[PDB]
Design a protein around this motif. Structure first.
Motif, PDB file in Angstrom:
ATOM      1  N   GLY A 180       9.864   6.064   0.333  1.00  0.00           N
ATOM      2  CA  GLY A 180      10.074   4.662   0.010  1.00  0.00           C
ATOM      3  C   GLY A 180       9.984   4.344  -1.470  1.00  0.00           C
ATOM      4  N   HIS A 181      10.565   3.214  -1.873  1.00  0.00           N
ATOM      5  CA  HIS A 181      10.444   2.734  -3.254  1.00  0.00           C
ATOM      6  C   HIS A 181       8.983   2.484  -3.595  1.00  0.00           C
ATOM      7  CE1 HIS A 181      14.519   1.351  -1.984  1.00  0.00           C
ATOM      8  NE2 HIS A 181      14.871   1.630  -3.226  1.00  0.00           N
ATOM      9  N   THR A 182       8.202   2.146  -2.571  1.00  0.00           N
ATOM     10  CA  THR A 182       6.783   1.869  -2.753  1.00  0.00           C
ATOM     11  C   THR A 182       6.085   3.116  -3.311  1.00  0.00           C
ATOM     12  OG1 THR A 182       6.767   0.236  -0.954  1.00  0.00           O
ATOM     13  CG2 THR A 182       4.631   1.110  -1.649  1.00  0.00           C
ATOM     14  N   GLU A 183       6.271   4.250  -2.629  1.00  0.00           N
ATOM     15  CA  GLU A 183       5.718   5.519  -3.081  1.00  0.00           C
ATOM     16  C   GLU A 183       6.356   5.988  -4.378  1.00  0.00           C
ATOM     17  OE1 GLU A 183       6.567   4.925   0.134  1.00  0.00           O
ATOM     18  OE2 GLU A 183       4.461   4.603   0.628  1.00  0.00           O
ATOM     19  N   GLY A 184       7.651   5.745  -4.530  1.00  0.00           N
ATOM     20  CA  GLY A 184       8.342   6.122  -5.748  1.00  0.00           C
ATOM     21  C   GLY A 184       7.718   5.434  -6.944  1.00  0.00           C
ATOM     22  N   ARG A 207       0.825  -1.209   0.000  1.00  0.00           N
ATOM     23  CA  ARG A 207       0.000   0.000   0.000  1.00  0.00           C
ATOM     24  C   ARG A 207       0.860   1.260   0.000  1.00  0.00           C
ATOM     25  NH1 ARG A 207      -5.318   0.062   1.772  1.00  0.00           N
ATOM     26  NH2 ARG A 207      -6.304  -1.989   2.041  1.00  0.00           N
ATOM     27  N   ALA A 208       0.856   2.007  -1.101  1.00  0.00           N
ATOM     28  CA  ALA A 208       1.580   3.270  -1.145  1.00  0.00           C
ATOM     29  C   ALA A 208       0.903   4.285  -0.241  1.00  0.00           C
ATOM     30  CB  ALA A 208       1.664   3.812  -2.576  1.00  0.00           C
ATOM     31  N   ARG A 209       1.705   5.051   0.479  1.00  0.00           N
ATOM     32  CA  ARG A 209       1.166   6.096   1.330  1.00  0.00           C
ATOM     33  C   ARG A 209       0.585   7.229   0.501  1.00  0.00           C
ATOM     34  NH1 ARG A 209       3.989   5.549   6.329  1.00  0.00           N
ATOM     35  NH2 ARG A 209       4.163   7.801   6.755  1.00  0.00           N
ATOM     36  N   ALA A 210      -0.541   7.773   0.953  1.00  0.00           N
ATOM     37  CA  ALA A 210      -1.091   8.962   0.327  1.00  0.00           C
ATOM     38  C   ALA A 210      -0.042  10.071   0.392  1.00  0.00           C
ATOM     39  CB  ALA A 210      -2.385   9.388   1.009  1.00  0.00           C
ATOM     40  N   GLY A 211       0.097  10.813  -0.702  1.00  0.00           N
ATOM     41  CA  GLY A 211       1.084  11.875  -0.798  1.00  0.00           C
ATOM     42  C   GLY A 211       2.383  11.425  -1.457  1.00  0.00           C
ATOM     43  N   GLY A 212       2.546  10.112  -1.607  1.00  0.00           N
ATOM     44  CA  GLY A 212       3.699   9.568  -2.312  1.00  0.00           C
ATOM     45  C   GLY A 212       5.019   9.909  -1.649  1.00  0.00           C
TER      46      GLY A 212
END
Ligand SMILES: O=C(NO)[C@H](O)[C@H](O)COP(=O)(O)O
Ligand SMILES: O=C(NO)[C@H](O)[C@H](O)COP(=O)(O)O
Lengths: 213, 217
Positions: free
Chosen positions: A149-153, A138-143
């Motif tokens: 993180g690579h997840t948000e990236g 789950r990517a965090r809101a706001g990226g």
């Protein structure tokens, strides 16, 4: 310093975005004082068995599917753990498997099938068995402006590129089992025509160009 | 070109098990095939107590990379590792617990050295739940009581092999993958074994052996 080979930070992001638009992969490095790791990233929109196979051959093999909170909720994917105490609060959901069109779920083709099934905007929870061999995040809101993180990236890159906001990530691993570090990531990118960029590059890009996403 | 004919070169079914046990006592890997009408997949198996970074690296290079730690139900319980999913609806009810990381002595958890650290931490029969962080990059599996005589899975075959070999009842497994991403089948598994000094055996080999020489583990 080594990253300069791929251009200035804004150029590095633009080249990554264009690679993804062309269905190619990119290599994303996080902060040196964080994981100091480089991940191969592919857009789900254009994901192929060949790309998945490469990822398995070259990376940790723990291939993760980066999703928006909204998509994860659509799929009814709760966090894998109620009380996450991993070092980086990595947002692993329950693992998943396509219920149709796969066998054991672990082959490159089977993982792509599962990923395509999960990332489908019209997907339903019952489209996926749990547990499985694909690991949604789950990517965090706001990226990347909220979590570096690579997840948000991954999700941010897709959104910035105008693609399906779902991507696959896996950590580049040296043959001896150690994790690829900056010189190895640079070499890999040059060898295999994959743009290299960092989370900080993305943070600067987003702030500079007023990208709310 | 049936499986029994291909496997004959590794010896008869009993010989194949005895060779696998010996390999494990010597701290080497083995290749375990399940039923052809089940997963029809071959897994590399290592004993935890002799596990090395180099062994782990080979698994990451050549297998799925989703390296699993087969545990007894008692061991999983002492680690506070119930099933990952209350209502498991995966094809063969693979008994995944939540994933784990060593609490101490690792960084990101995913390097070969880190996975070995996590696995040895988790397999320690004196381990406490606080010794592990969750989620992580090692995937524990709860073996069924009774082993391969209760469930004909690689999970059970792994733990049974360690017990039959007189080793601590913890082992790691990962599925052998062809370079094109497809899963290895009996011919490719056989070649890999002869390349990497790993004996090849089947779950049916194990079942027949236990029935003849080790009904209770
Ligand atoms: O550990 C992971 N996957 O298993 C992470 O998702 C990946 O390597 C980096 O994740 P993060 O940088 O978003 O925390
Ligand atoms: O899918 C798995 N691990 O990811 C299984 O543990 C492995 O393939 C063998 O499992 P099995 O115990 O069902 O034979």
């Amino acid at each position: 310093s080594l990253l300069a080979e791929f251009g200035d930070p804004i150029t590095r992001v633009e080249n990554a975005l264009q690679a993804l638009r062309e269905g190619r992969g990119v290599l994303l490095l996080d902060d040196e004082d964080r994981e100091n790791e480089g991940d191969i990233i592919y857009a789900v929109e254009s994901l192929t068995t060949a790309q998945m196979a490469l990822m398995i051959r070259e990376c940790s093999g723990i291939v993760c599917l980066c999703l928006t909170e909204a998509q994860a909720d659509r799929l009814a994917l709760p966090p894998m753990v109620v009380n996450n105490n991993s070092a980086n609060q990595t947002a692993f959901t329950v693992s998943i498997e396509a219920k149709h069109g796969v066998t054991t779920g672990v082959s490159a083709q089977d993982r792509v099938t599962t990923i395509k099934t999960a990332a489908n905007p019209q997907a339903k929870p019952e489209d996926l068995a749990r547990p499985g061999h694909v690991f949604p995040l789950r990517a965090r809101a706001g990226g990347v402006l909220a979590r570096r993180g690579h997840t948000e990236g991954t999700v941010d890159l897709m959104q910035m590129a105008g693609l399906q906001p779902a991507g696959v990530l896996c950590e580049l691993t040296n043959p001896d089992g150690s994790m690829a570090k900056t010189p190895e990531i640079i070499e890999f990118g040059k060898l295999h025509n994959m743009p290299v960029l960092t989370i900080e590059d993305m943070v600067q890009y987003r702030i500079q160009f007023d990208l709310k996403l």
